[PDB]
């Protein structure tokens, strides 16, 4: 139960150390965009990030204390939300653009290359705009990302000791909550402002969930149309949502 005995500062340190690297896309500027190639680039990248994400998850305090089957469920539920919040964060400093990778920066018109995608882009762009308005800090972002991992899936658990097991997840979520407040208190926010920013931050997660739900149906539509061949991990990740 080491995760429940961390100070806020140690919690923050642990999450910062855990952060995965920023990967490059296989984008070739000498290749003219098509629906297939764009979806090819995005899925290839996402497929490479999933591996790093799995390794990041193991470093989130509390996560390794769960059973393997719990760990699988949380990740199956959250993976696209986690990709999206990382994207939105990377993009905060590039208005009107999404920084999928440092060599792959797309605007909304380039999203129109893929059927149904531009509406997802617009929401992702809107979320980064909100992050920029709020002046979201890196220490707040790594708390939010971990909250997404632990929260998405915590209530859809199929079930024993399930109850007792979930109790541990809620204790960690509470620790992350304390850590956020700690951060905000340290930055000089009054009590009132602390509760207000905490709520604003957590209310963004609702939108991130909605975007993930929409993105998931879009990905599934791409698979069905055979637009791009999807990797076996990404397929498994997608199929876990049991769409149509």
């Amino acid at each position: 139960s080491l995760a429940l005995s961390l100070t806020a500062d140690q919690m923050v340190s642990a999450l910062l150390d855990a952060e995965p690297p920023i990967l490059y896309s296989e984008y070739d500027p000498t290749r003219p965009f098509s629906e297939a190639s764009m979806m090819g680039l995005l899925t290839n990248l996402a497929d490479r990030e999933l591996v790093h994400m799995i390794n990041w998850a193991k470093r989130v305090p509390g996560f390794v204390d769960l059973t393997l089957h719990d760990q699988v469920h949380l990740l199956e539920c959250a993976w696209l939300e986690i990709l999206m919040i990382g994207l939105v964060w990377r993009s905060m400093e590039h208005p009107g653009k999404l920084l999928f990778a440092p060599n792959l920066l797309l605007d909304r018109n380039q999203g129109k290359c893929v059927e149904g995608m531009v509406e997802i882009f617009d929401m992702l762009l809107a979320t980064s705009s909100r992050f920029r308005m709020m002046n979201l800090q890196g220490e707040e972002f790594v708390c939010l990302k971990s909250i997404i991992l632990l929260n998405s899936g915590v209530y859809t658990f199929l079930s024993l000791k399930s109850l007792e097991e979930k109790d541990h997840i809620h204790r960690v979520l509470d620790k992350i909550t304390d850590t956020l407040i700690h951060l905000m208190a340290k930055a000089g926010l009054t009590l009132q402002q602390q509760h207000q920013r905490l709520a604003q931050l957590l209310l963004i997660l609702s939108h991130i969930r909605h975007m993930s739900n929409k993105g998931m149906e879009h990905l599934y539509s791409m698979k069905c149309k055979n637009v791009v061949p999807l990797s076996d991990l990404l397929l498994e990740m997608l199929d876990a949502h049991r769409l149509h």
Partner: peptide
């Protein structure tokens, strides 16, 4: 023990 994700979580 058959899912790819399960395998990668085990390493």
């Amino acid at each position: 023990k058959h899912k790819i994700l399960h395998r990668l979580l085990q390493d």
